[model samples]
Target: MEDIKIKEIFENIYEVDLGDGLKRIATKSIVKGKKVYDEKIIKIGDEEYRIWNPNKSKLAAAIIKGLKVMPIKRDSKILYLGASAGTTPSHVADIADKGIVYAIEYAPRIMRELLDACAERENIIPILGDANKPQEYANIVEKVDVIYEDVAQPNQAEILIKNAKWFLKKGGYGMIAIKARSIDVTKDPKEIFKEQKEILEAGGFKIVDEVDIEPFEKDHVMFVGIWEGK
Candidate 1:
């Protein structure tokens, strides 16, 4: 391997700049040998970097697709909804070293896998609870810096709002992975996105960036915004 280079995009987020237009998210690997989604691990100097696969994570796809702002930091606490199998949450854990990632997954079967994946990482708190009912886990998590939702529900934007109201701090950041098919299979995906955008704006979130994850995730769009509600 050629000498791996690192470029700082945001606090705690480095673009692992490889020679030939190839780059990946570089973080201090929390799980030494564990592979989330079988991502490759590379070591440079004293630190190890995980190849964040856009194919496996919507957030990664958004980053690759050119997201405007990067809200996650070394000390930014995150409330991750729909943390299935902990792939993205693990990368969040790798970046949020000083903060915590409250990963909420409702499925018992998937929760079991998520639990084991997060066991070695001290920063990730895997909560086996529904994203809709944020009150159920209110006792466990405090106000957070970001609320990232990937729940494939009909009312996906509403769920992000619900969770944001409960756990997100005022003026925090939020990103929702909206699967159009999950919302309405019959309607046009763009129309579904528009409706969801309206819902988010009405709920006091300032939509900053939105992109369609094509060739990576079908009928999926990531909505990035800042929470303005108290």
Candidate 2:
């Protein structure tokens, strides 16, 4: 077998080359000998990597779709909204190995799984809270460098804005994965996307990067914005 090639794409994020003209994205596992979400693990020169599956992670799909900028860094303090099963939060924790990931999830059922994934990853702090009312968790989450949101509520972008206003630092970043149908199933996906984009812009977030995560997620798009509070 030929040697697998791995290159750092953004901070702690990596792109793995299998020498077969195929590429995959991954993150160096902060916790070795641990499995978060059925992801394939690989070890290179004593470093462990978790294959970031785009099909399951909208952020991975965005990166695979040629997202130009990634704001999360090795030491970025992040507030993750809608941390549903902790799939992406796990990878985010891997990317921000030296930083903190305050993961918030509303459902008690899903919180159990997130708790399991957050067990070994010391950087991940699980919060059983709602993304809508950021003030509720204000006492727990401090000003953060980035807020990554993947909630499916009808007020998805609004939820992001509300959280950004509370937890995001002045120059922090917001990564939002939008599901067009979730907002307005009757409207055209593009129309829904535009309306949501306008809301973000009006809410004092400057759109920096946008990627359509299709095939991986139906009618889904991801936006990276710079927070400039209104």
Best by lDDT: 2
Residues 1-230 of candidate 2 have per-residue lDDT tens digits of 88878899879899988888766999999888888887998887778999999988899999998899899999999998875677898899999989999988888888898887767888988888878888998998989999998888799898888898888888899999998988887999999999999999999899999899887998989999999987
Model 1 regions lying over 4 Å from their true place: 1-4
Model 1: lowest-lDDT 10 consecutive positions: 19-28
Candidate 2, overall lDDT? 0.89
Give the clash total for candidate 1: 0
In order, the Cα lDDT scores of the candidates are: 0.84, 0.89
- Pairs that clash in candidate 1: none
